[PDB]
């Protein structure tokens, strides 16, 4: 080991050129040869709106089981730009390793010109491979940037430049082939977490609810008659919850729901409020809150504890 | 001379001291609210002879549709008035997007409507709504502002409303349109208008609402990993004749979604696939179902959605309206 | 027909690799399906080579070509570190509605991912559309339209540098259409009064930097040289310490004209009537300086360029 | 019972000697802290000096070797807290809270920030999460770490944000949300000792620009400046006038540092241009760090390591 040992996972298509697809992938960027000894894993084949939190777990499952390896150094996972957040975030909490985990994504197709996925590739391969990537957290490249799992998200529908932490701001960044890591994130994860789910094949289940004007109290029923153990309320404001939303809050609380006030804003804190029903997120967005609530309700369904898990993770 | 501006006040005042050391509050027994706010603020008188109204008054997430129907035909009333030159709204800062994309859409007057809000209690220690008002006051007054669409003024900025959003759940800066930028800022009590929104509003909009008592049901769908169906079901059956989808990326659906998305296409809903993302264009993509945003946010989708289906359920002029407003 | 429309190259190409605009075009042949392209190589320099006197060609020379009927647009490669200065001179001096759309790349034409290739596409998708006339200049690049007169480098190395983050963009491209979002509220093009097209020099201008201890000796060092304006990159809203307070003084009384802009990399800098010299409005030092120097050639009168300041 | 937090005063009040109108112009502060107002100096930021910069380090150290002393607020001007407080930042020997404060608007302006900034400064300065962060900026419910932070807007109350490296921390409803650790040196695993020191190294920035003058480099030349801050054109780029200048500077021994105009991001390393490279620290921080280096080397290699490290 001297040029370290990198697996890059597919949960998808490749991200870059035109066999599985991450032997397309590593042909068609032969520079990452230079970077580190990679070896493909076709862990799965679907398009990242439809990757789920049973496959999620699976990979979570397999990456402890790489970095377990003594002749492997780091994993690189493509993923599909719309959710890697999530899974990127779910293995932020469950890999109980300091070895990197590097998500990389493409926001182009591989056969676009000007296609990001390339340098992208070549940037995660970089960060997983480099020995300073160590104790960071679930990382996700693309773009130059590095972002934490817990706090980036993709924050336009269609750009290169779609993922960012507004407040938090980027680990690092990758400029002329060499890695500037600037933040390491102030909360715990990884080998610090206490969610391990290497027992688990099924996650509870936990729906999101927009928070709008005339918001209909009838979405809380149906997610409650369909036995979810948490709500997560992606909603007005700092979690702001109208008299149609309150009440919904109300039924879900006497069935032992937990009930996760977030917000759709995009960022920033949802303060404490008594006043208000339910829990609150923190600065997690919706779909990471969402993560985290169903990894709560795994171990506990204590509003008390699972409140200072949102507030520590 | 000095313009004239109604003050409509839709909640509680954000302007306003309580009492602590010596001082006595300007919470007076009674006080409406309007009052409280104009009387909290005097250095408005300065800028325009003012006339507080007050409206409504609730917190903005429990603003309704049917409210900001009254509302549009509230202002209409007043800026068809030759005693106004312009109006200021004030809002709670949660739904006032929403809002304030309704009257963009629907006041048939060139006469600046300018919303203004607050994130800090007025009774808190440095709360922006004072010099809020006062900006909000001075951009109603001037005359540079007509024409251009409804503001939100707010931290010493102008906010189109077709393109302003909370972007953050606490901070004062948190109004931001990152891509499309402010049309003005206000700085050293001048306004520096910087961008005309190119897009149809007010005069040039075809959603007249002027007889309507009611307003189509939209509901808003979000996207994520293990996505249920049965939330596209629900709506179906509490009979919304839309829906947007407040979609993963650029508008992605699963299995899941695009079952329950064209259960409710069969029934005569249309689609309206939007993005959570907060930011950017929902591309065409006739492979997917329903219609695209544009780079119209859930909660302005919806709102724009509600007042096409006012006039239409036809999906291909519905999609022009979201190219075109 | 599709449109008609000219590139002009400034320096080395963006797409592809071997004139450098015959490669460009060459390199990305989607383009002949927006538009009918010739290439033209105006010069061959990085833009931190790039000058005034040369730009001063360029809008001279995008003028004669606008001039013609037969021609729609012009899209003009040039590099990333000045493109904001070319476009905003052009911006002024250029006397058509015709689209003008400066394009560029944060990635050499050779590199993995090099983002040339698109950012080309885009530029002369803008050029080619007739939404896109009466605009003022135009910078296209990582998808966006940038207005010339707001959009700036925001960043030493990233593709997504090019920000106007108070006011935004013009416009974005994505799936091979255009969404228009803006039309700046300012003066421009055919409404400019700047018309430089009988010129062959432009009066000379410097940018000093405001900090801490920043030194008189740079304001006489301008003066001894010749400068007909300063442009002062201020700490914060164009504030001057006792030293730069000294030299623009010493500046004004030798009948230079300053212009208090600011460092900070964005917003107003407001009249000051207590401090010397103008100030920028919402114009960085880059931009401030290049409304000077054209400003300079019809006034040195402080309240008329005032005026172009808050307007242009 | 509450710490116990200094605050110096480098200016006029932001709230309502400036440091005692401060205090009693915010009352709310004496329930967080056991406040000792203390005016250092009193000059607009735009007139800090680097002697004086010096002696407020020297100075805070003092109180932060004090066991009666948990922390220090330091209220300072907008328009260059950011090199007063990257300055204390390399030279503060103390894990102790060193939190600069300032305002947007005038005490008197309505809706003034000075108030809710004290507040939250102070509110930071007392935390004892606050430890070993390096020196904060407070302004706008926000932390930001005086290494990233930086005035990007000549006039408004939100100016204060490092784009790519985010805030520290964030204060919202009374209570501190941490964020990240600066992944950087400083405080006491500083190098920076400057305790001893009278005066300090002439470092001067010069603008890259479209027909950017060489002459400027000559006086900078002349005038015996011992660094150039290049705020430059792009990534440090250089005109081939400022190639020249940047030469005949080296000839004479200055150490010349590529920094950028652009606001924000990296200069890499490019052996074929000359002078140094600033990573990401802006030309005013560029400076700051440039003028301790040269109180302890002018070898271009350590002050390099200094640059990416610092």
């Known amino acids: 080991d001297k040029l370290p040992n990198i697996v890059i996972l597919a949960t998808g298509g490749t991200i870059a ?83 990197p985990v590097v998500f990389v994504a493409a926001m182009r197709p591989a056969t676009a010109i000007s296609a990001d996925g390339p340098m992208n590739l070549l940037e995660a391969v970089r960060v997983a491979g480099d020995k300073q990537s160590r104790g960071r957290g679930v990382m996700v490249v693309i773009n130059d940037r590095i972002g934490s799992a817990r706090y980036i998200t993709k924050t336009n529908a269609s750009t290169l430049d779609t993922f960012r932490a507004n407040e938090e701001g980027y ?33 509870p289940k936990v729906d999101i609810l927009y928070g709008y004007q005339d918001d209909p109290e009838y979405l809380y029923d149906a997610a409650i008659q369909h036995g979810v153990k948490g709500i997560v309320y992606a909603g007005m404001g700092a979690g702001s919850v109208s008299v149609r939303g309150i009440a919904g809050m109300r039924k879900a609380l006497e069935k032992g729901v937990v009930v996760m006030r977030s917000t759709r804003t995009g960022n920033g804190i949802v303060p404490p409020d008594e006043e208000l029903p339910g829990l609150v997120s923190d600065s997690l967005n919706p779909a990471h809150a969402r993560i985290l609530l169903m990894l709560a309700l795994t171990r506990t369904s204590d509003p008390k504890v699972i409140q200072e898990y949102f507030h520590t993770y």
């Open 171 to 203: 680990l690092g960044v990758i400029i002329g082939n060499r890695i500037y890591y600037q933040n390491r994130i102030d909360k715990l994860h990884t080998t610090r977490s206490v969610f391990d789910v290497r027992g688990l094949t099924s996650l």
């Open 17 to 99: 050129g035109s066999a599985l697809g991450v032997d397309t992938l590593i042909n068609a960027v032969p520079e990452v040869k230079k970077l580190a000894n990679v070896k493909g894993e076709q862990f799965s084949n679907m398009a990242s709106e439809n990757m789920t939190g049973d496959v999620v777990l699976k990979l979570s499952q397999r990456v402890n089981e790489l970095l377990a390896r003594d002749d492997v150094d780091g994993v690189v996972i493509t993923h599909g730009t719309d959710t890697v957040e999530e899974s990127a975030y779910f293995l932020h909490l469950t890999v109980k390793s300091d070895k």
